Design goal:
Order of helices and strands of chain B: HHHHE
Keywords (chain B): Mitochondrion, Ribonucleoprotein, Ribosomal protein
Family (chain B): Belongs to the mitochondrion-specific ribosomal protein mL50 family.
Oligomer: part of a larger assembly
GO cellular component, one term (chain B): mitochondrion
Protein name (chain B): Large ribosomal subunit protein mL50
Radius of gyration of chain A: 26 Å
CATH superfamily of chain A: Glutaredoxin
Structural class of chain B: mainly alpha
Number of helices of chain A: 3
Largest interface: A-B, 18 and 14 residues
Helix content of chain B: 25-40%
Radius of gyration of chain B: 19 Å
Strand content of chain A: 15-25%
Main location (chain B): mitochondrion
Number of strands of chain A: 6
Chain lengths: 148, 105
């Protein structure tokens, strides 16, 4: 629930797409087992898909560890300094490729409740409403029931 | 007393045709020698044993029945086999600079 969870406003890292778009994902670490059914899909991913992904995303450094492990994992690091650990345990190649692409598309901002589906730093052009907007001025600036 | 372990790595020789022709001629002569049947066990054994010792690579038990004719033997010996670890296979896959693979085994 919202009351049970932290929230944030919609934001970018450094006004990402304003000047030029910079891919937020920086590093991607994979822990894969040579032997082990959990990492089967992961192995097949490393065999076919990771090379092409690396070519497509030159800004991201990909590390493949290939060590004994019961659960294979992918660790995603972002420019803002966020770290995300995602289990690729007993996942197909398609599922892993999907997940990895999602990580590439995501920024480092926390996946929590976003308060407003829009964000602007200049909401007003004509000038924000105040009580004296849409009020006429009076001669000599006389208050009601003022003699002088 | 124990010979060193042999690699499974085999590259088909360019002059494989001539080698096979000579060995068929030795073991068995007729025209269209590719179509010579290996139904006889003696002749088949002799040919395959000779080729195994010479090329250092042997037809597996599973593929033995498939070797009906000399053509099949030629087809088998023109297929390369690469013997290398997966780490070596990944490394020699022309990796991009951003991709880095390590082996903890």
């Amino acid at each position: 629930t919202a009351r049970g969870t932290p929230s944030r406003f919609l934001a970018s890292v450094l006004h990402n797409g304003l000047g030029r778009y910079v891919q937020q994902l920086q590093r991607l670490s994979f822990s894969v087992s040579r032997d082990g059914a959990s990492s089967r899909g992961a192995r097949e991913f490393v065999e076919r898909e990771v090379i092409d992904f690396a070519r497509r995303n030159p800004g991201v450094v990909i590390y493949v560890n290939s060590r004994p492990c019961c659960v294979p994992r992918v660790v995603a690091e972002y420019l803002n300094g966020a770290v995300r650990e995602e289990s690729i345990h007993c996942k197909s190649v398609e599922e892993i490729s999907t997940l990895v692409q999602k990580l590439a598309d995501q920024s480092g901002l926390d996946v929590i409740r976003i308060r407003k589906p829009f964000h602007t730093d200049n909401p007003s052009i004509q000038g924000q409403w105040h009580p004296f907007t849409n009020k006429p001025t009076t001669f000599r600036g006389l208050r009601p029931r003022e003699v002088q | 007393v124990c010979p060193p372990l042999r690699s499974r790595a085999y590259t088909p020789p360019e002059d494989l045709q001539s080698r096979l022709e000579s060995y068929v001629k030795e073991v068995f002569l007729p025209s269209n020698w590719q179509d010579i049947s290996l139904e006889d066990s003696r002749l088949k054994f002799n040919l395959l044993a000779h080729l195994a010792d010479d090329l250092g690579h042997v037809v597996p038990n599973s593929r033995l029945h498939q070797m009906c004719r000399v053509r099949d033997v030629l087809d088998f010996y023109n297929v390369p086999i690469q013997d290398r670890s997966k780490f070596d296979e990944l490394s020699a896959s022309n990796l991009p600079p951003n991709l880095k693979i390590t082996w903890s085994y």
